[PDB]
């Protein structure tokens, strides 16, 4: 379910159904890159091709989180990718913020 | 559990704040991230607390970030199209895994998605 249109837009059908894995999502981008080669294109990721997607979207959201808010502390801006990985894998529902100051982080966690 | 297990770089403080050491090093896996949250939930039980995720315990964390997430992305911008607002969790999953530098946005309208994608 990957095409490059004559309009210049890549359309990726992801996920295919109610199964959602990290290896799948990474493989998808691999194929996008293989199809593009050296050129770059906007991309539509169509996650609405089947009602089974939203069955998976509800299950991914149903997974629990006992944190009331989450401060994520790194040592450089690149650690933002690690925060997003964590929040994305875990479908974190609560307030979240990125810091590079532990004192800023801890103070923000006290704002409850 | 009444049984003593593994520290898991996890503590609930007397200040009522959870502190998670994640990632522990330069290795980054989805399973580890999930396991880390499982341990947070098991420790908390019925109660809820603010959490600090300390991703700055070692210089090897950022080095892993760059090593696993610096991969090329041939997409110039990404519109992720769902059916309902809850489908955003899938968008966040995809983008969390793939760590793209380009503009990304969530839609439930295909027309809106395409219009936005064409601001190229």
């Amino acid at each position: 379910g990957l095409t490059l249109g004559g309009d210049g837009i890549l359309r990726l059908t992801w996920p295919r159904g109610a199964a959602i894995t990290a290896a799948d999502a990474e493989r998808a981008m691999l194929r996008v890159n293989q199809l593009c080669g050296d050129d770059r294109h906007p991309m539509l990721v169509d996650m609405a091709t089947t009602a089974d997607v939203s069955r998976g979207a509800r299950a991914v959201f149903g997974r629990p989180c006992q944190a009331s808010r989450i401060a994520l502390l790194g040592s450089s801006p690149v650690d933002r990718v690690l925060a997003n990985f964590f929040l994305g894998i875990n479908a974190v529902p609560c307030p979240t913020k990125f810091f590079t100051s532990e004192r800023d982080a801890l103070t923000w966690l006290a704002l409850t």
Side-chain angles (χ1 to χ4, degrees), chain A residues 4-15 17-26 28-53:
Chain A
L4 180 64
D7 60 353
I9 295 181
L10 290 146
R11 298 172 168 81
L12 173 71
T13 300
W14 181 91
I20 287 89
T21 73
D24 209 77
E26 191 190 340
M29 187 71 71
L30 218 65
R31 304 305 204 194
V32 169
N33 294 327
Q34 294 175 31
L35 173 54
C36 293
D38 296 317
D39 301 300
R40 309 177 76 239
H41 300 288
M43 173 162 67
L44 185 66
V45 181
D46 183 0
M47 315 183 299
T49 47
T50 178
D52 290 70
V53 165

Side-chain angles (χ1 to χ4, degrees), chain A residues 72-90 98:
Chain A
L72 302 101
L73 181 78
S75 353
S76 101
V78 78
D79 294 346
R80 204 179 280 275
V81 172
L82 279 183
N84 294 333
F85 181 79
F86 188 83
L87 301 182
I89 293 291
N90 288 313
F98 176 77

Side-chain angles (χ1 to χ4, degrees), chain A residues 62-102 104-109:
Chain A
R63 66 211 301 175
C65 180
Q66 291 307 281
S68 62
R69 51 212 272 130
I70 300 183
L72 302 101
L73 181 78
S75 353
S76 101
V78 78
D79 294 346
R80 204 179 280 275
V81 172
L82 279 183
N84 294 333
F85 181 79
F86 188 83
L87 301 182
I89 293 291
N90 288 313
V92 159
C94 61
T96 65
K97 197 171 197 296
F98 176 77
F99 304 84
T100 56
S101 160
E102 185 163 26
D104 286 1
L106 285 170
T107 299
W108 182 84
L109 293 173

